[PDB]
Structures are given as structure tokens and as C-alpha cells.
Design a protein around this motif. Structure first.
Motif, PDB file in Angstrom:
ATOM      1  N   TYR A  42      30.147 -20.571 140.660  1.00 19.80           N
ATOM      2  CA  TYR A  42      31.368 -19.767 140.703  1.00 19.80           C
ATOM      3  C   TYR A  42      32.114 -19.817 139.380  1.00 19.80           C
ATOM      4  O   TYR A  42      32.636 -18.795 138.915  1.00 19.80           O
ATOM      5  CB  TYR A  42      32.276 -20.238 141.836  1.00 19.80           C
ATOM      6  N   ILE A  43      32.202 -21.001 138.773  1.00 19.92           N
ATOM      7  CA  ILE A  43      32.846 -21.126 137.468  1.00 19.92           C
ATOM      8  C   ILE A  43      32.110 -20.282 136.435  1.00 19.92           C
ATOM      9  O   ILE A  43      32.725 -19.635 135.578  1.00 19.92           O
ATOM     10  CB  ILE A  43      32.921 -22.613 137.068  1.00 19.92           C
ATOM     11  N   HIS A  44      30.780 -20.248 136.512  1.00 19.99           N
ATOM     12  CA  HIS A  44      30.031 -19.372 135.620  1.00 19.99           C
ATOM     13  C   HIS A  44      30.360 -17.903 135.876  1.00 19.99           C
ATOM     14  O   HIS A  44      30.531 -17.127 134.929  1.00 19.99           O
ATOM     15  CB  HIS A  44      28.531 -19.635 135.766  1.00 19.99           C
ATOM     16  N   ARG A  93      32.595 -29.622 132.043  1.00 24.51           N
ATOM     17  CA  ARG A  93      31.187 -29.413 131.710  1.00 24.51           C
ATOM     18  C   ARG A  93      30.724 -28.015 132.100  1.00 24.51           C
ATOM     19  O   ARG A  93      30.077 -27.316 131.307  1.00 24.51           O
ATOM     20  CB  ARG A  93      30.316 -30.463 132.394  1.00 24.51           C
ATOM     21  N   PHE A  94      31.032 -27.597 133.329  1.00 27.38           N
ATOM     22  CA  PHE A  94      30.606 -26.280 133.791  1.00 27.38           C
ATOM     23  C   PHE A  94      31.279 -25.174 132.995  1.00 27.38           C
ATOM     24  O   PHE A  94      30.638 -24.174 132.650  1.00 27.38           O
ATOM     25  CB  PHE A  94      30.912 -26.117 135.280  1.00 27.38           C
ATOM     26  N   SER A  95      32.577 -25.325 132.718  1.00 21.84           N
ATOM     27  CA  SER A  95      33.295 -24.315 131.948  1.00 21.84           C
ATOM     28  C   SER A  95      32.759 -24.223 130.526  1.00 21.84           C
ATOM     29  O   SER A  95      32.567 -23.123 129.995  1.00 21.84           O
ATOM     30  CB  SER A  95      34.796 -24.624 131.940  1.00 21.84           C
ATOM     31  N   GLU A  96      32.512 -25.370 129.887  1.00 24.27           N
ATOM     32  CA  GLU A  96      32.010 -25.352 128.517  1.00 24.27           C
ATOM     33  C   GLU A  96      30.632 -24.703 128.440  1.00 24.27           C
ATOM     34  O   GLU A  96      30.336 -23.971 127.486  1.00 24.27           O
ATOM     35  CB  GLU A  96      31.968 -26.777 127.961  1.00 24.27           C
ATOM     36  N   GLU A  97      29.761 -24.981 129.421  1.00 26.27           N
ATOM     37  CA  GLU A  97      28.438 -24.355 129.436  1.00 26.27           C
ATOM     38  C   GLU A  97      28.551 -22.839 129.441  1.00 26.27           C
ATOM     39  O   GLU A  97      27.818 -22.145 128.728  1.00 26.27           O
ATOM     40  CB  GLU A  97      27.645 -24.786 130.672  1.00 26.27           C
ATOM     41  N   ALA A  98      29.447 -22.304 130.270  1.00 24.12           N
ATOM     42  CA  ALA A  98      29.513 -20.858 130.422  1.00 24.12           C
ATOM     43  C   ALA A  98      30.217 -20.203 129.240  1.00 24.12           C
ATOM     44  O   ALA A  98      29.809 -19.130 128.793  1.00 24.12           O
ATOM     45  CB  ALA A  98      30.197 -20.506 131.746  1.00 24.12           C
ATOM     46  N   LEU A  99      31.271 -20.827 128.710  1.00 25.72           N
ATOM     47  CA  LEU A  99      31.893 -20.284 127.508  1.00 25.72           C
ATOM     48  C   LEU A  99      30.900 -20.255 126.356  1.00 25.72           C
ATOM     49  O   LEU A  99      30.774 -19.242 125.657  1.00 25.72           O
ATOM     50  CB  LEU A  99      33.125 -21.098 127.135  1.00 25.72           C
ATOM     51  N   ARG A 100      30.167 -21.357 126.160  1.00 26.55           N
ATOM     52  CA  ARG A 100      29.155 -21.410 125.108  1.00 26.55           C
ATOM     53  C   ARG A 100      28.099 -20.329 125.307  1.00 26.55           C
ATOM     54  O   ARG A 100      27.714 -19.637 124.356  1.00 26.55           O
ATOM     55  CB  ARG A 100      28.507 -22.799 125.082  1.00 26.55           C
ATOM     56  N   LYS A 101      27.621 -20.170 126.545  1.00 32.75           N
ATOM     57  CA  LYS A 101      26.642 -19.130 126.847  1.00 32.75           C
ATOM     58  C   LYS A 101      27.137 -17.756 126.416  1.00 32.75           C
ATOM     59  O   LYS A 101      26.338 -16.907 126.002  1.00 32.75           O
ATOM     60  CB  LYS A 101      26.323 -19.142 128.347  1.00 32.75           C
ATOM     61  N   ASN A 102      28.448 -17.530 126.471  1.00 33.66           N
ATOM     62  CA  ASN A 102      29.038 -16.247 126.131  1.00 33.66           C
ATOM     63  C   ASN A 102      29.507 -16.163 124.683  1.00 33.66           C
ATOM     64  O   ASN A 102      30.138 -15.169 124.311  1.00 33.66           O
ATOM     65  CB  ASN A 102      30.208 -15.947 127.075  1.00 33.66           C
ATOM     66  N   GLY A 103      29.210 -17.164 123.859  1.00 35.75           N
ATOM     67  CA  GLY A 103      29.657 -17.132 122.477  1.00 35.75           C
ATOM     68  C   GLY A 103      31.158 -17.222 122.313  1.00 35.75           C
ATOM     69  O   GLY A 103      31.694 -16.738 121.311  1.00 35.75           O
ATOM     70  N   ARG A 104      31.846 -17.847 123.266  1.00 34.91           N
ATOM     71  CA  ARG A 104      33.297 -17.965 123.301  1.00 34.91           C
ATOM     72  C   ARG A 104      33.753 -19.341 122.829  1.00 34.91           C
ATOM     73  O   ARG A 104      33.043 -20.337 122.992  1.00 34.91           O
ATOM     74  CB  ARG A 104      33.813 -17.739 124.725  1.00 34.91           C
ATOM     75  N   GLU A 105      34.968 -19.393 122.275  1.00 32.01           N
ATOM     76  CA  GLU A 105      35.595 -20.680 121.976  1.00 32.01           C
ATOM     77  C   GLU A 105      35.719 -21.519 123.243  1.00 32.01           C
ATOM     78  O   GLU A 105      35.977 -20.992 124.331  1.00 32.01           O
ATOM     79  CB  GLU A 105      36.991 -20.477 121.378  1.00 32.01           C
TER      80      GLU A 105
END
Length: 230
Positions: A42-44, A93-105
Motif C-alpha cells: 500500500y505504501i508503494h 524502509r518501505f517509503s524509501e524503497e518506493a521513492l527511490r524506485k521513482n527517482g524521488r528525493e
């Protein structure tokens, strides 16, 4: 993916919230602790959809007062503090994974990260002032506290527990500490405008938008409900 862009249907708190949402300047994603809704998947979804739609994305996690929610439902402080740390680390951890996946800060904060921010502190002081001096506002905050404890009671499987006044007043410290982001998150963080986004209505916000208190939302702040539909 047009599936990702339409992952959520948006319901604004007010017409002003709708305008801020349509400007797509900034979304603040509220991740509630000890809530089974906020799985990794869901966070993703939240972050994937936000990244396709908004110019800027920030994730808000629970601060220190999250332990109050546990201490009210039968957790000694030692275990409560450890459970909060573990929950925030997983949300991060979950939030950082998804932001990184999207090229986001990796723009992730807890609501405890702004004690040196004048906007947060001044809105917080206003919230505390009217909690003490306006019985109507106090009643609404205590209802938000009741909502938070009722949800987790069910969630930590404890629905036989009477929710006492002492439980409500201990847990309302969480409500009061998070409320400045509902009222003024854009100005606290430094964006021209923002919507805080969550999957449930905010009844107190409906009253604030009905001009029922001296507590007001900032003109550049909105609230949106995120629904998922077929």
C-alpha cells in the motif's frame, strides 16, 4: 502506466482543497502507525501514484507521541518505545524503497522533526491553547483520540476494553502533536501549497472548514481522502 495514475480516486475536504489538489504542487502522505492498512504494497501504491501526479512528494511518519497510543492500550513505556522505533523504521524502509524506485528525493519526516520550526511550534501552541480554552475544540480533539484508540483496540484485538477518559487524555497528546500538519503542513515544510492525503474522512476538518473554531487551516493547505475504486 495509466493504471498507476488512476490508482486512487480523490475526495477533497472543501472546494479550496480541490483547487490545491488540482494544482498538484505538493502532497504530504500521512502514514499512520499501528494500522494494518499501511502494508509495504500500500505504501508503494501511495508513493507510485503520488510520483506520477504531484510535482513534490513528502511522507509524514508518526513522532514520539505514537507511544502514547500504545501506553493507553496496555503497553508499558519500555515496550511502547521499542514498538514505535520498529514501526517507524519499517515505514521508512518501505517509503524509501518506493521513492527511490521513482527517482524521488527521500523526503520523509516524523511529526517530531520540527521542534525548531517556528511555524510548527506556533500552530502547535495555538492547538494547545484552544484545547485548553475551547470546550468544543477540546471535545473534537478527544473524539480524534477516541478514533485512534478504537481503531488500534480492534487492530491489536482488544475490543473488550473500555476507553476511559485517562486513556483519551493520554492519547490526545498524539492528536495535538500531529494536528499542525493538518492545519499548516505546506507552510511548515516550505511549499507554496500542499494537500495532506489519507484514506479516511477528517471530521474535525469538516468543522474547521465550516468556520466553527478560531483554529483555521492555512489558506494554502488542503486535505484529500484517497479512495480506491474498480
Amino acid at each position: 502506466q495509466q493504471v498507476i495514475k488512476d490508482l486512487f480516486y480523490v475526495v477533497p475536504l472543501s472546494r479550496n482543497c480541490e483547487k490545491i489538489y488540482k494544482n498538484k504542487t505538493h502532497i504530504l502522505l500521512g502514514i499512520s502507525p499501528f494500522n494494518s492498512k499501511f502494508s509495504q504494497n500500500y505504501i508503494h501504491q501511495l508513493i507510485d501514484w503520488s510520483s506520477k501526479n504531484f510535482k513534490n512528494v513528502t511522507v509524514l511518519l508518526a513522532g514520539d507521541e505514537a507511544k502514547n497510543l500504545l501506553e493507553a492500550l496496555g503497553t508499558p513505556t519500555t515496550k511502547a518505545e521499542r514498538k514505535v522505533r520498529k514501526e517507524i523504521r519499517r515505514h521508512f524502509r518501505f517509503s524509501e524503497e518506493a521513492l527511490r524506485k521513482n527517482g524521488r528525493e527521500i523526503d520523509i519526516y516524523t511529526f517530531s522533526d520540527f521542534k525548531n520550526n517556528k511555524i510548527y511550534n506556533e500552530v502547535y501552541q495555538n492547538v494547545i491553547y484552544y484545547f485548553e480554552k475551547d470546550e468544543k475544540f477540546r471535545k473534537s480533539c478527544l473524539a480524534m483520540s477516541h478514533d485512534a484508540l478504537s481503531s488500534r483496540a480492534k487492530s491489536l484485538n482488544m475490543e473488550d476494553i473500555e476507553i476511559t477518559d485517562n486513556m483519551l487524555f493520554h492519547a490526545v497528546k498524539y492528536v495535538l502533536a500531529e494536528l499542525p500538519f493538518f492545519l499548516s503542513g505546506a507552510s511548515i515544510l516550505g511549499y507554496k501549497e500542499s494537500v495532506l492525503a489519507y484514506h479516511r474522512p477528517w471530521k474535525l476538518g469538516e468543522k474547521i472548514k465550516n468556520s466553527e473554531f478560531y483554529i483555521k487551516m492555512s489558506d494554502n493547505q488542503g486535505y484529500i481522502i484517497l479512495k480506491q475504486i474498480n
